Design a protein around this ligand. Structure first.
Ligand SMILES: CC(C)CCC[C@@H](C)[C@H]1CC[C@H]2[C@@H]3CC=C4C[C@@H](OC(=O)CCC(=O)O)CC[C@]4(C)[C@H]3CC[C@]12C
Lengths: 37, 60
């Protein structure tokens, strides 16, 4: 189980995190730009 | 500082449940690293540790 967790953590979780980071930051930036003080 | 630890542990477990607020961080220096550490703590507890428990039952 530890070996499997290490395997999934490095390979699949790297791709998922890298996929999510730009999407999240850009979408949140878009929402922030939407608002006007 | 046993009393401080005793209080904070209850607060931290409550935050782990998903209810409460992290108001105690006012006395901390370098709050950013504390935020990051709590972020990673939540990520490990919810995403990886909890998921592996889910997976084990399915395969067995
Ligand atoms: C995730 C699994 C494997 C670990 C199990 C979690 C417990 C170790 C945590 C969850 C809630 C925690 C408790 C939350 C509140 C208290 C009361 C606290 O003493 C007090 O009464 C002062 C604080 C208060 O009165 O609320 C001492 C620790 C204890 C038992 C905490 C110690 C650790 C506990 C039992």
């Amino acid at each position: 189980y530890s070996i499997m967790i290490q395997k999934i953590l490095f390979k699949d979780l790297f791709r998922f995190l890298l996929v999510y980071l730009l999407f999240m930051i850009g979408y949140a930036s878009a929402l922030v730009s939407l608002l006007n003080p | 500082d046993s009393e401080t630890f005793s209080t904070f542990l209850l607060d931290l477990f409550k935050l782990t449940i998903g209810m409460g607020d992290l108001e105690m961080l006012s006395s901390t220096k370098y709050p950013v690293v504390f935020i990051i550490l709590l972020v990673t703590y939540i990520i490990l507890t919810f995403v990886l540790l909890l998921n592996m428990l889910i997976a084990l039952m399915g395969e067995t």
